[PDB]
Design a protein around this ligand. Structure first.
Ligand SMILES: [Cl-]
Length: 263
């Protein structure tokens, strides 16, 4: 509706920043879109694509998720809540996937990236799925610079919603691997203040958040199972003009409420 568009424009104005939204309602194959073809820095939401690239690779290498990866002090970056507990030991690729998706562990992300061949390989995986917008340019932590106008480490809301639908509800991944990604995302510990905060308590959500720590950039990408309804995919990206702007997860929650009200 023009109503929902008006409400998103008003939310964006009040917030002082730039808001990107894409909702896919699988009940009727409809979309609600707001700046959905503009580029936004992904921040940690890019962890979904890295984990999915490793899952795709595991379809032809059954030992892969069990493969051990050394964690060293030289691997630590800016935020390592799980990896810091395993320094001088190993973690499996499954454990790194869960740490990246459920705790936003940046060492875990770098190990997933390295395993598949680096940022260009994560990007080539996205291209193989039919996503010609996603670009992972850098590793952690520098992928988070979020400079306005910089296309590095960005995607569009439309593209990420369509790709997340393919990954979690479609056939991008084999049945076991799809189920594994959904289980990982449903087990996220970091998303209650974002999309989930704008949805009824009963709805079931798998999501990955991302706060770059620069330009107050605050994002969330989610698969949503409303009570007794077909699932939704919702992507909400937000970034602000000031380099040291504070995070605005409430803006993502407000957008989520606007685009789902009535469902
Ligand atoms: Cl409620």
């Amino acid at each position: 509706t023009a109503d929902v568009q008006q409400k998103l424009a008003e939310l964006e104005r009040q917030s002082g920043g730039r808001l990107g939204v894409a909702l896919i309602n699988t009940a009727d194959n409809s979309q609600i879109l707001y700046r959905a073809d503009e580029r936004f820095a992904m921040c940690s939401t890019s962890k979904v694509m890295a984990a999915a690239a490793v899952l795709k690779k595991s379809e032809s290498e059954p030992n892969l998720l069990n493969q051990r990866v050394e964690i060293k002090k030289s691997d630590l970056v800016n935020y390592n809540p799980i990896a810091e507990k395993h320094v001088n030991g190993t973690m499996s690729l499954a454990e790194l996937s869960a740490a990246a998706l459920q705790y936003s562990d940046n060492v875990a992300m770098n190990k997933l990236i390295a395993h598949v061949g680096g940022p260009a390989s994560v990007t080539a995986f996205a291209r193989q799925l039919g996503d010609e917008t996603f670009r992972l340019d850098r590793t952690e932590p520098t992928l988070n610079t979020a400079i306005p106008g910089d296309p590095r480490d960005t995607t569009s809301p439309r593209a990420m919603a369509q790709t997340l639908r393919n990954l979690t509800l479609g056939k991008a991944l084999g049945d076991s691997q799809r189920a594994q990604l959904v289980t990982w995302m449903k087990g996220n510990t970091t998303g209650a203040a974002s999309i989930q905060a704008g949805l009824p308590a009963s709805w079931v959500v798998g999501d990955k958040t991302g706060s770059c720590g620069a330009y107050g950039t605050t994002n969330d990408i989610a698969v949503i199972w409303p009570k007794d309804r077909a699932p939704l995919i919702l992507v909400t990206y937000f970034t602000q003009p000031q380099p040291k702007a504070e995070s605005r997860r409430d803006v993502l929650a407000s957008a989520a409420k606007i685009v789902t009200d009535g469902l």
